[PDB]
């Protein structure tokens, strides 16, 4: 009965860690803002429509000049576009084309993608041949690559279905640290401003924070009811934001160990795929299955607005470094810049 | 707008562009996607490799050849996965000087994978293979873990062990390794640009794939037949046939695949016509009551498979019975496949 | 079974460690984050936002 | 390995043609705008006609229309040159000269190694101005090399169109500096490039050894593309 006592003591573990957030719960965020203006009226309006991709897209970043942005569509297609003239400025073939995740490198040098090939395919933007070239395909996840987000242009984290993250060093192709511990599916992840910490969601409904260089898990958070698909840290880089099936976004802190608010409309049931910040950190916007963006007062937990611009599932979204724009991109085969 | 010439010049290129993506575009909509699914060693990427070798004029000679130590390398782990079950299930060689190649065979197990296939390792496994008390394990090979290609090769060792053996097509069909992430090829047949994708190793939560999949022409789930007479693992829920049936009732009534063909190989029927002629269906199936012919035994289970379907009125299951190593077998089911996707579409 | 029992100390362990970690009261995280918001109100476009001389998405 | 090596170029009789060829290897080529710049015995460069990624774009430098034609093979990686009624004033090294157009390139980053054309015996355009025509530098100092435009090469998109080159001797011309401050790919830090509109600077700190030679400024506000006169920097 081994098995027994241990399966036990975590339930004690638990209930010691439930007692000790309850311990320091002695307000609630929407109490603590209940004297602050509403922000009110959101109107943001369609400022560009990106057209070119032919299949569902799935995944898009801006790299950190706020003007280009990486997206990544089935149709085999990676597309870097100029967000201010919506020029192409490449278009990079996949080798496969059952993507589901790309990013950006903050150097501007690079851009990631990958999916059920189960491979971090990085592509150099800067070659001396003109075009861009697949220089590493990461192997070694044994499910699907659900998200990437680079920290240089020698280092980028990747997060798995097969239940795993790893930081990765691309000059060698290994993972040379892992991030274990989640018991299902790792869909999305999201690098601390710092670089420091990341954060995980998953489809054992919970968040989980990371220390990078440590390559543990520092903070697990639970209180979904099912799969978190997407994941944002607050700017200042002390709290996060997960979207889920569950039809609800939730605001994590860090250093209270605890969820803050939960986002949600009692006519709202469908999924959640994706969630970001404005640069202030006041409004959360989410991407939703029923093709719509819903803009939250992450404060308190009033709907400011809507961006309603697509004919199916809002599958990605970010904001600019800058605060300018907001990009969508979706099932419809469409990216809008908005603002 | 007032351009620059570097503005105008980059307006061009993204035209161009335009005109590329466009144009890959007629292509991909004309394209036929076939999405292999079924469980792990059912014959997924058999079949890939029987669409090279049937429409892509694949596994020439000299391709064959980079097969060789996958050929030694998968001879060499089933005779010693068999040698490894006989300490387990306490069976003795039928002869005592076989003890010897046996701990020869572990120590000569330390040579890379290259060019093997030393004659003294030869020997080696020529000599277990012949024992009787090694036999009586292979005939046990349903209660531990072995390479369904086991017998090929180990039947076949003197010409595989020449040192200029060259690969046969069907020395690479019978070859086993394992891979992740998907695999895909395409062809052309009967003018349609056919793109077969093989999910192959995918350690995750279907539901969170699977809607990557809508719109794809069909779908051909495998099935090994053979499978259904092995015993339950260590914590085994269900035993492997049922496991598959699992999967199919899954995949075949998922919304994501309303609009997509339903195509079932029962496949390895070979090893499976061999297999029920001594061990009944009953140990799969305990409440079936027909007799252990081949053709008894293969409809009822094609009866098990076809019943998972919730919808029987609005969708047709199209089931074939295939031996996915013999190529001329496939060349004919395909062939099948095709005219049924082209008088449907 | 011997895969169970090697899990299921792994999560004791992680739980071990979760609850000896520093813990700030809510008041003080929520506080924190009101401020935020409100110090940075002003530099964000989404928010707050700016004339369309300034905004890239409008210009030429 | 980037290569564009030019052929066709001799000794041709006045009012006579020639075609020149330029072959690339070691890039996309059909992904790249492409250029004749020529250079005459003792004197700087000067653009002689463009023909863009795709042809779908050709102009051509006043005193050369009606008598060349530029035009590429793509399928065969190749530029060519097609020159007619040939006068003494198009004796010169002639270069071909890659350029790629997006958010961010660098154009004008790859010269041939050049080939050479000699001919027997018998406005509105931007002007740019690099008034001084030489300066004698010591190793290890800091030089500072101007340039002036007749029109602000500063757009309203931001960008300010102007490009510096370095001619070592005997050697082709090499990219430094694009869009006035973009450093090219290769170039050590000790190089910069500033201005404002209608004049801008080059800077060199601690001068070395293979810093000689002659330094061009050029502006891609318009076409036709021009330069400067050039000025040399001499060892003391
Ligand atoms: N005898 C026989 N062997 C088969 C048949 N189909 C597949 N195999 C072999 O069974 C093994 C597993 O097949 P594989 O294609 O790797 O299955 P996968 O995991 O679904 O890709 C390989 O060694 C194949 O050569 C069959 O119909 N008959």
């Known amino acids: 009965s081994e098995l027994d006592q241990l399966r036990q003591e975590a339930e004690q573990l638990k209930n010691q860690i439930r007692d000790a957030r309850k311990a320091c719960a002695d307000a609630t965020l929407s109490q603590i803002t209940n004297n602050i203006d509403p922000v009110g ?266 961006l309603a611009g697509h004919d199916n599932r809002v599958s990605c979204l970010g904001v600019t470094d800058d605060g300018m724009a907001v990009a969508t991109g979706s099932w419809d085969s469409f990216l809008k810049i908005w603002n | 707008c007032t351009l620059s ?144 290609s086991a017998a090929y090769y180990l039947n076949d060792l003197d010409r595989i062990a020449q040192p200029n053996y060259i690969p046969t097509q069907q020395d690479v069909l019978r070859t086993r390794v394992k891979t992740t992430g998907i695999v895909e090829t395409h062809f052309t047949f009967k003018d349609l640009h056919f793109k077969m994708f093989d999910v192959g190793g995918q350690r995750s939560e279907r539901k969170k794939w699977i809607h990557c999949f809508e719109g794809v022409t069909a779908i051909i789930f495998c099935v090994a037949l053979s499978d259904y007479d092995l015993v339950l693992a260590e914590d085994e829920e269900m035993n492997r046939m049922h496991e598959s049936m699992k999967l199919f009732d899954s995949i075949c009534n998922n919304k994501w695949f309303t609009d997509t063909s339903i195509i079932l190989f029962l496949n390895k ?57 013999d190529t001329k077998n496939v060349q004919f089911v395909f062939d099948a496949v095709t005219d049924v996707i082209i008088k449907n579409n | 079974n011997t895969a169970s029992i090697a899990q299921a100390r792994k999560l004791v362990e992680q739980l071990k460690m979760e609850a000896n970690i520093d813990r700030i009261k809510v008041s003080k995280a929520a506080a924190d984050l009101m401020a935020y918001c409100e110090a940075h109100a002003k530099e964000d476009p989404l928010l707050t936002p700016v004339p369309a001389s300034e905004n890239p998405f409008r210009e030429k | ?96 000269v890659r350029s790629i157009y997006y958010y961010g390139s660098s154009p004008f980053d790859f010269w041939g190694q050049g080939t050479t054309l000699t001919v027997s015996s018998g406005g509105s355009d931007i002007v740019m101005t690099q008034a001084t025509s030489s300066v004698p530098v010591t190793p290890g100092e800091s030089v500072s090399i101007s340039c002036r435009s007749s029109k602000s090469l500063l757009h309203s998109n931001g960008n300010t169109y102007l490009y510096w080159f370095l001619q070592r001797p005997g050697q082709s011309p090499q990219l430094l500096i694009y869009r006035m401050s973009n450093l090219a790919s290769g170039v050590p830090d000790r190089f910069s490039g500033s201005g404002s509109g209608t004049a801008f600077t080059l800077t060199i700190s601690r001068l070395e050894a293979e810093d000689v030679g002659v330094y061009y400024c050029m502006q891609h506000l318009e076409y036709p593309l021009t330069f400067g006169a050039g000025t040399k920097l001499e060892l003391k």
């Open chain 1, 41 to 306: 009226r959101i109107q943001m309006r369609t400022r560009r429509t990106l057209r070119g991709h032919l299949a569902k897209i799935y995944a898009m970043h801006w790299g950190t000049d706020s003007r280009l942005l990486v997206s990544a569509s089935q149709d085999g297609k990676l597309i870097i576009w100029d967000s201010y003239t919506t020029n192409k400025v490449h278009a990079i073939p996949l080798r496969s084309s059952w993507v589901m995740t790309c990013a950006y490198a903050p150097s501007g040098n690079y851009v990631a993608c990958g999916g059920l090939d189960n491979i971090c395919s990085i592509y150099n933007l800067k070659t001396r041949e003109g075009n861009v070239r697949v220089s590493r395909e990461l192997a070694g996840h044994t499910g699907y690559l659900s998200c990437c987000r680079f920290l240089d242009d020698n280092q980028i984290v990747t997060s798995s279905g097969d239940t795993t993250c790893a930081l990765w060093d691309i000059e060698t192709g290994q993972q040379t640290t892992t991030f274990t511990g989640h018991t299902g599916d790792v869909m999305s992840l999201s690098l601390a401003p710092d670089t420091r910490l990341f954060v995980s969601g998953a489809c054992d409904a919970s968040a989980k924070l990371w220390d990078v260089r440590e390559g543990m898990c520092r903070q697990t958070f639970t209180g979904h009811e099912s799969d978190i698909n997407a994941i944002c840290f607050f700017p200042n880089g002390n709290a996060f934001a997960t979207g889920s099936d569950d039809a609800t976004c939730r605001l994590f802190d860090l250093r209270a160990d605890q969820e803050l608010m939960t986002y949600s409309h009692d006519n709202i049931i469908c999924g959640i795929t994706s969630v970001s910040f404005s640069k202030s950190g006041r409004l959360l916007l989410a991407g939703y299955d029923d093709f719509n963006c819903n803009v939250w007062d992450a404060l308190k937990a009033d709907r400011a607005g809507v």
């Open chain 2, 269 to 325: 029927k070979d090893l499976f016509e061999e297999k029920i002629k001594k061990s009944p269906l009953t140990i799969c199936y305990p409440e079936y009551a027909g007799s252990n012919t081949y053709e008894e035994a293969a409809a009822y289970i094609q009866c098990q498979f076809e019943d998972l379907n919730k919808r029987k009125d609005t969708k047709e299951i199209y089931t074939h019975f295939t031996c996915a190593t």
């Open chain 2, 5 to 148: 010439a570097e503005d105008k010049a980059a307006v061009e290129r993204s035209k161009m562009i335009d005109r590329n993506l466009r144009e890959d575009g007629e292509k991909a909509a004309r394209e036929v996607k076939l999405l292999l699914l079924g469980a792990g060693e059912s014959g997924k990427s058999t079949i890939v490799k029987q669409m090279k070798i049937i429409h892509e004029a694949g596994y020439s000679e000299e391709e064959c050849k980079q097969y060789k130590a996958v050929v030694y390398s998968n001879t060499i782990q089933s005779i010693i996965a068999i040698i490894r079950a006989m300490g387990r299930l306490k069976i003795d060689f039928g002869d005592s000087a076989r003890a010897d190649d046996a701990r020869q065979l572990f120590v000569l197990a330390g040579a890379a994978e290259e060019g093997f296939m030393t004659a003294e390792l030869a020997g080696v496994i020529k000599r277990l293979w012949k024992d009787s008390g090694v036999q009586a394990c292979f005939n046990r090979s349903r209660e531990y873990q072995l390479n369904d």
């Open chain 4, 1 to 96: 390995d980037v290569q564009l090596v030019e052929s066709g170029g001799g000794l041709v009789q006045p009012g006579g043609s020639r075609k020149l060829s330029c072959s690339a290897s070691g890039f996309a080529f059909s992904s790249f705008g492409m250029h004749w710049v020529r250079q005459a015995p003792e004197k700087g460069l000067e653009w002689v006609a463009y023909i863009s990624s795709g042809s779908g774009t050709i102009y051509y430098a006043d005193t050369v229309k009606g008598r060349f034609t530029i035009s590429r093979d793509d399928p065969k990686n190749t530029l060519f040159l097609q020159m007619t009624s040939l006068r003494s004033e198009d004796t010169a090294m002639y270069y071909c």
